[PDB]
Design a protein around this ligand. Structure first.
Ligand SMILES: N[C@@H](Cc1ccccc1)C(=O)O
Ligand SMILES: N[C@@H](Cc1ccccc1)C(=O)O
Ligand SMILES: N[C@@H](Cc1ccccc1)C(=O)O
Ligand SMILES: N[C@@H](Cc1ccccc1)C(=O)O
Ligand SMILES: N[C@@H](Cc1ccccc1)C(=O)O
Ligand SMILES: [Zn+2]
Ligand SMILES: [Zn+2]
Ligand SMILES: [Zn+2]
Ligand SMILES: [Zn+2]
Ligand SMILES: [Zn+2]
Ligand SMILES: [Zn+2]
Ligand SMILES: [Zn+2]
Ligand SMILES: [Zn+2]
Ligand SMILES: [Zn+2]
Lengths: 84, 166, 184, 171, 184, 171, 166, 83, 182, 82, 162, 162, 85, 83
């Protein structure tokens, strides 16, 4: 997938970091060590890692992804990445 | 099961009366082993039952339960809220949900989650919120809160719910 | 819409049905307290459903006023009496209405008439809540409308609360929060 | 007394009458929301009328929730019952008192009759020195204000000081 | 009694008078908010005085029921809306009624209708209080009647309370005390 | 503005109209209780419309009693006004604020207009950072339920945190 | 009298400002001698005025007065009751009675009696009862009560009055 | 028509994603499989898709659009794209 | 600061002005109920203005305590009695105070003394609100201070609010304060 | 005057869009079809258009402006152009 | 106990009272026992979705004046797989309140004890009390973990304790 | 004062506390001054239609345990040509409440002081208080003269103090 | 590249000042060029430099000094720009 | 470790500025003069400096970092830097 969205809540220094959805590249999710789950009552599955977002950003750079934008929305900090 | 276990419950309550230093033969205690056994069976009848665009709330639902740690009642109220998609919950079905789970040996946190999960499974709504407030007999009040779906993800939905249950 | 002629023509049929109910419950319809009950219950049921005799366009006659500048307009604690369509038992409570007009406002008594048309019918609380909100939205084309109904259902302390937020009441949380704060 | 068999046999007649009411009000009994209404309304009405199927201290049981039906208009009236008595040799168990209130309230009633029936039932059951019964209820016939009815029997009628103590203690 | 024909015939005269009042206050009767006020105020005044269209004997049709044994009967917190005859400004509040029947009782809704006939007139609180008490006494011939009216007079926090005690409510202080205790 | 002379000159015309109303309602204007009513009603109506004759803190004046007249039906509406503002260089004296509420409320009104007029008058008088006005009133047109109107100007509109502090402090 | 005495009152308030250690020339105190004098004249305007089958009660009449011992306001409510014979008191006349006596330098007991005597003299009723409740600025509340005629002689009349003023 | 605004609410992983307004390019709206609607009480029509925003971003790249900025506002996550 | 000697020396002067007021209102100063009024009114006025006899530095003696970790400190419903300087008529009500210490706290009775020093003077509510807030800020150097005064003016309630430091800058701190003072 | 700030509130799909302040270039404001107004109680005048912000962005590109940044603040969506 | 009784006996003499009068006869021992009961917290040790326990009655003693301060404690926490039994929570409030205290310290000690015992995501503690040595109420508030970091968690807690 | 301070210093040592810690440094003197303030009534003397003064705030100290009891006093009297000034009534409540007391004694002492000062037809005194050494409220009532002899006077008083 | 970053901000509305342009360690020459004043808002633990101008005017002035906007963000009721030379 | 996150709360003109987490480069943390701490109840350690964020940005430029993005979230102002 050319674009990726990652996020963390409450504090930027600590995980979990959300790294994917049902249409994410399964190989990249496995490379990040992500687990799949559906939070109670939600209509979608998500991939997450225990790592803080800075670790995930460093890993995604080694996979050719670059941060295009970072934004805060509610108590969520989101990064939008794109392959080169 | 109730008829078969009633004499065993009554024998245990008779034993309790003697172990407390009381006289089980005194007038006021003669029928107590059977009455206490029947009351305990009624308080736990929930084990005999099985599950089968607007914000919708049902607040101040009276709730009576038994604490599993000490076997002493805990009583209070349940406030429920949900954002339906295609299905809405009939008032009598909601009461049956609260009854099934509350009429068991419980912990307030488990009861709160079981009601929220039962509504989520029955309706498949956008989200559900459940707040239970109760006095544990074993002035102080325990308040437990479960927010699922959009009630957890969208703080504005949860805030509207908490404001409307006042 | 139901007419006064429809009421006169159907009154004996409603009375016959209520007399049949009295007999089917094991009661004596000839005892003093029940003698005129077929007609009293029939007339009461006609009154509880008198909203079928009214139309929203008739309520809207001379109902709209204009303003150069807008403000939040709320009418809270409007007493509401309705009939559950599932069990034919009343559900009673209150309606709180809020709207942010866009140059057109409803007269206060016409807003109350809007609650009356829809509540005086066989209803479900959710439909009643939406019909009031939609009628105001369509009549005034305001920036937004919020309607909260709270009622006790006699067929069931326990209260049902339904809430509809339209336009800016849905889109702008600050507008909705001001409304919910002011209805306390 | 009305039997469970009477209820099963009369349910379709109640449903037919409720269906006839829906048509006579100008409603469509075939619309989804009203399809099961004849049966739901019939069952609710049977439940509301299930009552036809059934020492030197002052003793009071106050704030007993009460649900009844006005016999003049067939609309509910709801509220509370406060009971007081001066026993002689017998005291009334709480569950038996609840059954007394339930038997008479779950009928087509007038609040005055309900008040007297509860007072007479306690007098006959216990043979006490006196009984007082106060019922307070909101009448849906009115709202669509509280009615308070009071019956004092035995020493509750004869001794104003007993009645005053009772009325003070039910606040 | 005032008829529906009397209302239709007198409505233009009431509207002409209210239009004259608008002009005499220095207001512009042609501005949007006042355009239909002559007719709205005339219709509202007719509604506030609709008790002149009713008669106590017509209210008493099917109003009386019998009982073998008596009890104290009270209906408290009956909302009341009336018009001061001295200033033509509303006075609003509550009516508390009590009676000790002597074998005849009024239907609850008929008691409310009695408050309605007399309150929906140009009144003085003292006359209204007595008319309700006298109507019940004459209709039922009970052992006694007590009526308490409490109202805020808009032409004036401050409340006027009037009290009439007839029959055993006057003669037996214990009956009056039970009534006053139960209306709290 | 309406003068004291205008009042004296128009009093008989108001009285004549009130006398005509008494006759048109089916009443007897010659009965003792109604003899002086044309003049008393006329004087009361003139009094109700006498309005036509006329720093780093948040500052609030709440629970200001308000009496007005609905212009649609000519029936009173009564309640309270809560005022808030963030001053720049000028603060409003309590008696001047009361005069503002009185001037606009003592007229034939709609609650929305009254709310805006008070907010605009404070804005123009003080030139503050912002003003908020909330009016809550019972409308006799309805009772024979509370209407709440709210106007936020300047920073009270632009900064939701200022408006929230104001709404919290007026409880 | 008001215009002639206003400068003397203002001179006295100016003197008070200096004797308290304050600066009468500071911006906030410049007009205080005149404003305090005008307020005191308004609080004592009652000296400019003169008196010229049911139980009837007017309760919760707001009352504002000045204590004569310390010159500090006392504020509260007046509840009045009477049993008329041939004359009934108009609401605005009753308000004028309370105003005339309260807008003076007073003691709560005198005020209570003056209102009761004015109603007795105006109406010649069977009896009058007056209860004043006030906070004296100089939480604690002073309650004074005067019962005249049948309100004193018949305890049942007084009891009905006291019950109905709740 | 070089600029585009797209958005999603509450969670970034799931749709609907808003992709247009009344004056949007109808061909691009059809290409995305968008539907037009006016939410109750709103004074405007909008185009939306059921897809989560990441899918829409991938589709828009194939049409020559690049993300210039992404921001949060209330419970809405917005992207500003440019071709 | 005003001294106890100043009070004894000026009490006869206050009594002469209150007697003159009694004569200027048309009252008889020689009637029984008014004989001691010049002195009682003079003593009451001195008591209402006793705040001029104290200084904030005197109140701050032994007033400060230290803590390793902070949290929100609120003292609500502090009864307040003051005199309006424009008309010399009391204004009475309550003061609600909140602060987030930065390692220094005030003893509870010392916080009450701060309200007393400023309220017992000829005042305007706005000045009183700010003086209390500034006194706490200067004494403790906290992260922030919030002061809300609500009063009835005897000459309907006036509510004044001052938010300083983080109580102004961080809306979440101010919101917690406003929620907890209900 | 190389920098420009534009904004919209509540929803991004609909105007009004704020496009200027008292010191804005009057010719550019006229080019956008903007009107001048002072919202009641505000201490400043503003220029606004009925168009949604996407239309304004397209128009500003034809005038040589480019979006440097976009942000949300409260219920306002702001663009900084150069 | 005898040293506390000797001190209370000495106080009764230093006030101008008659320690031999009926009402004061056993007061040195009763006052000593009451003071020991008010400070029994020094004898105890901590080793021996949203969850809230509100309106917990609290009795403590002001360390500055030795006069009681009484009120309520409201506690909230977001657990991480471990929950606190109601009697253990009461023991926590008791351990710290039954000492010579300042309301701020007591508030923090309860919050830290719950954080250490359960290792939750966060804890919030609000104490409200009337101080007899001063009507007015002192309210202190401690927010730890997500109760400090996430304002939405803190707001839900403050709403639910009403 | 130094003897009271020495006794409070001794109490701080007999509890297991550190009298040298910041919060307790000046406590022997602050506690001594608070206790002197609570017992200042021993320094004062009484020589230096229906009328009611209700909701008079009252603060006193239980003589059995030395723990405060706080509440309100409601006073009523029927004068005989002499009336009590409000500040003198407050001084009466103060003189007796600011001592080591039992609520019954304090109630009677206030009633007797008013009877002796005014020689009225009768006096009624009701005290309601919360006792910290115990929520529950203790209510004591003394009726003298016509307040005892005439039940109608007592009933009017009890009705008017609500 | 000496002191390359700058943060400026405005509150409530973007069209009107004050605009915050500095802190205690800001370049005194750049503060004087912008016409800024120094102040410590009551209760704050820091001094700030501010101007009456709306932020767009400040951005235009900072461009003439070699600064470029890298980012703009909203936080609470504050609109912030991060500039770099 | 090419990415860096820094942040400040409440006001941009004053510190503390958060500059690291448990996995941060301890040599860079020492270069910034940062201290390590775990705020009460938190499940993580953080590195912080007393300096306002503008000073930290200037220091990070001298270590080859550039600001890629700045955003507000709650009462926190965050910068995302890259080598
Ligand atoms: N619901 C998220 C905000 C969010 C909105 C849209 C997309 C992603 C996240 C929060 O409250 O933190
Ligand atoms: N109203 C949106 C925020 C928003 C404002 C402006 C434009 C776009 C979206 C929300 O509360 O989520
Ligand atoms: N007051 C704006 C936010 C804003 C702040 C700063 C600059 C511009 C806008 C709102 O609440 O939507
Ligand atoms: N305190 C600012 C937000 C902010 C946080 C961090 C840095 C800068 C500003 C506000 O509420 O508007
Ligand atoms: N909890 C932070 C916001 C935040 C969310 C996500 C990551 C970083 C910070 C605040 O309220 O200030
Ligand atoms: Zn248990
Ligand atoms: Zn139903
Ligand atoms: Zn009926
Ligand atoms: Zn009148
Ligand atoms: Zn009207
Ligand atoms: Zn005095
Ligand atoms: Zn003044
Ligand atoms: Zn202390
Ligand atoms: Zn004791």
């Amino acid at each position: 997938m050319p674009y990726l969205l990652i996020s963390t809540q409450i504090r930027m220094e600590v995980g979990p970091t959300m790294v994917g959805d049902e249409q994410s590249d399964p190989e990249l999710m496995q490379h990040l060590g992500a687990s799949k789950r559906r939070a109670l009552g939600n209509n979608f599955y998500e991939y997450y890692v225990d790592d803080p977002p800075r670790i995930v950003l460093d890993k995604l750079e080694r996979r050719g992804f670059r941060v295009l934008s970072m934004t805060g929305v509610g108590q969520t900090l989101v990064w939008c990445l794109h392959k080169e | 099961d109730n008829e078969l276990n009633l004499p065993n419950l009554a024998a245990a309550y008779s034993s309790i009366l003697s172990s407390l230093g009381e006289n089980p033969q005194r007038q006021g205690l003669l029928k107590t082993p059977w009455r206490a056994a029947s009351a305990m069976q009624f308080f736990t009848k929930g084990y005999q039952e099985t599950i089968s665009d607007e914000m919708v709330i049902v607040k101040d639902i009276d709730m009576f339960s038994m604490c599993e740690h000490h076997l002493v009642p805990f009583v209070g109220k349940v406030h429920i809220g949900y954002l339906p998609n295609k299905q809405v919950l009939g008032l009598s079905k909601l009461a049956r949900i609260v009854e099934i789970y509350s009429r068991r040996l419980q912990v307030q946190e488990r009861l709160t989650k079981q009601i929220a999960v039962a509504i989520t499974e029955a309706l498949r709504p956008a989200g559900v919120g459940v707040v239970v407030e109760a006095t544990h007999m074993c002035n102080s009040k325990t308040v437990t809160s479960t927010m699922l779906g959009v009630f957890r993800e969208d703080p504005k939905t949860r805030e509207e719910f908490l404001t409307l249950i006042r």
